[PDB]
Amino acid sequence: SIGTAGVPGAGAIMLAMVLHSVGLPLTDPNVAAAYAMILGIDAILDMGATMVNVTGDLTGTAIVAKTE
Amino acid sequence: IEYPVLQKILIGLILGAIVGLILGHYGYAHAVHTYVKPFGDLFVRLLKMLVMPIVFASLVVGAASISPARLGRVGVKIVVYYLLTSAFAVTLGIIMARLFNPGAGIHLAVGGQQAPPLVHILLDIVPTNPFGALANGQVLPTIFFAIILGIAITYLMNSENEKVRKSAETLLDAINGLAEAMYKIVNGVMQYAPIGVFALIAYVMAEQGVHVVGELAKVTAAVYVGLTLQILLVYFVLLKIYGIDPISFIKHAKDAMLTAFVTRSSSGTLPVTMRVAKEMGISEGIYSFTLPLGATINMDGTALYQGVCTFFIANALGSHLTVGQQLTIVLTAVLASIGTAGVPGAGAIMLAMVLHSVGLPLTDPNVAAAYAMILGIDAILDMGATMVNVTGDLTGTAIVAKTE
Amino acid sequence: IEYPVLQKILIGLILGAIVGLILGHYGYAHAVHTYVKPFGDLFVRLLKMLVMPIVFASLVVGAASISPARLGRVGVKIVVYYLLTSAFAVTLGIIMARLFNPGAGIHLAVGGAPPLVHILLDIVPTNPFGALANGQVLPTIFFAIILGIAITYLMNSENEKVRKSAETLLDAINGLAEAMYKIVNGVMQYAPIGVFALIAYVMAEQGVHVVGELAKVTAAVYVGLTLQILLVYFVLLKIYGIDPISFIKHAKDAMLTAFVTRSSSGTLPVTMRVAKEMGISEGIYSFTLPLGATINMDGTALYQGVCTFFIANALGSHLTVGQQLTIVLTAVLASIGTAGVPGAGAIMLAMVLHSVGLPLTDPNVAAAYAMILGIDAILDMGATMVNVTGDLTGTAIVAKTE
Amino acid sequence: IAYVMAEQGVHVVGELAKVTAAVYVGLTLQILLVYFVLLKIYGIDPISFIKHAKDAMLTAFVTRSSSG
């Protein structure tokens, strides 16, 4: 998901989706266990990730703007 | 179709456990499941098959025993039997859950900090159609009917009419024809038991053995040696104290325990469980009413597994667990489903249900996390708990029997 | 409540076929369905009723026969029996599907999962009482065999309460088993009404369709199986003593029910009673007529040989002539078992298309398939009747061996 | 009409094609004999009409959707 990373909680979704690809499916009750720990911390890890995204959005704007 | 007896089972068990534990470590746990599992099932299939006739039929006949007492007594005794075994099992679990301390690697604490009617389950005992009862599974209403039928047959034989006294015999004999017929099959099955046992704890060791590692393994220690201590210190102490020879007991009860461990199903082993009580030499008037009412009333297993697992979680979310107030939660767990502990995987369910009561709901993604670890080890923790239940079932039978 | 015997059936059949085929041509096919059908059902009803007791009961008693062989043998034989009849049925269908060429008027060309082990484990019921209750032939089969073998062993018990009760049960069960054969004739007295009413409707609601290129599949079925009876079964009855015309004599009623009930298993009461009155022992026919009804492929092999052609040739394809078999064999082998249900033939035919690569979505695949579905009942009658003829043939030959 | 000819062209064969004939020339005859007869009879020049309406017809035929 190059695109559509804007929605809150999205990070957790891909993290799960990767496990489908890794070959460790979320059924395996210890895969699901560790994943659940991340889910008990995702909101904290989401705040920082979005704030650094919107800092990166303006940085990208102000640099391209000060060109074209 | 020949060869050595119940060492053939022990050849399957040890050889399976090894070949499965190996095969799942190298990841083929799924491939083991698609190739091995179905021979392990075909064993449990054939055993299940019998469970309905072999109980129903045996217990109509088992009401040929003296009805007012025997089925009025013993029931009173075998109830009070499980009270005083489950009491010991609780304190043996708690004192195993402190001994081993499963809550060190996690260590990962999350805050928090924070419906059965019975009467509408009591009225369920009494079926409203005994034919359906039998048909659609159901052990504990079929129990009630069979007892009420065989008592009624007893009373028909004492009828001054002799067409009545006549037919009365016909039915009861024909029913014992079945009852017996099934014990015949139970050995026919047993000849497939080494294949069954090999294939079952091959898979169950592949798909949940690898998990028995680290802090997870520290619960499996306090279960497996915790129940090993229930056998030796509580049951043999009761067998010794009631005549019946402890080692001669394991001799006879070998096959019922090796099936209970591998089938992981209390009720699903009752054919074998009962045949061991025949060949042990108890009368049908007891074992036909104490081995099924055992499989569904026995708490020795769940009291010992949700004693050490209740700790693991309370201690993994980094809590005091009110040491010595463990019991408050462990007792209330058992008592929430005194009955209906026979189904496989039931232990996990109550463990979850307790958390609803503790105040830590399964939503809290770290509650759910720790619980999920137990769920990756439940099958291993289930085998031992059922095997120690069906050992406790026969121990209860052979002691009450050698009284009344 | 009296009158002539099984000519009364043949009076119903011919008189019904005519009155129905007539009545549906003039469109009252629906009205026939709301007035005639329910007397045709009441026949299949009463027959169905028996199927469970009459099989279960008969086969506990049929394990009074010598268990290690007989139920260990024959099973080996009757399996290998159907192998060598279905083989002949396949090549009799393909060589009927070339002979008649059903794919000329269309001519309209468009481009273009079973585990087994989790069906093998289904043979063993987990509750025999339920098994019986909730239909189910092939797990009831397995129980009854296992019971009657167990009873056998109880009689050789040194105890004589045991040896006692053992008898009681087995006798009481044979009481039932027998009781049911008694009813099977009670039913048969309603068989002329049942037959008349059934192929009255089935000829009204699907007879009119047996016309044109559709009729050119009905030819290669009906004469294709007529040739299975004469050239494959009689050749096997002749070659194993048992007299071919004395066989049809005795098996008259089981074939006329199989044709009209269109249900293999739904005729087993009559099918079995013909094997009693024929004189085979329960130790054989109680295990080869039900394991026949569900393992027999003579019908589906001959109907999805000529219907497989019709579709492949109606979408204007080569059909890899002489490589018909690749598809026809794979069809049979996809449901070796469980061919007993009525309408089953249509299902596999569809399922084959999933494998051929022409899915039922392609609105001309679905078009040709829908024509077969407007004729399936006529093609089903003949296929079942030749199955239950093949069932008794298999029985009477294996029986007159072991 | 690459796809629409792949997925339903092959079918335009035999008795099915005999409906496609009576449609396609049946409407070709609606254009010429009914519409041009009305365009002729109301001034507006028939061939100058197709000139202008070229693109609306080649979209209607391919989009297969009146309103679209």
Residue numbers in the entry:
A (entry chain E): 349 to 416
B (entry chain C): 8 to 121, 127 to 416
C (entry chain A): 8 to 119, 127 to 416
D (entry chain D): 213 to 280
Reproduce text from the manuscript describing this model.
However, removal of Arg397 may affect local electrostatics, potentially altering ion binding; thus these studies should be interpreted with caution. Within the NMD motif, the side chain of Asn310 rotates away from TM3 and partially fills the empty Na1 site, while the side chain of Met311 undergoes an opposite movement, flipping away from the binding sites. Finally, TM3 bends away from the NMD motif, particularly around Thr92 and Ser93. The overall structures of the apo transport domain remain as closed and compacted as in the fully bound forms.
GltPh, like EAATs, is a homo-trimer.
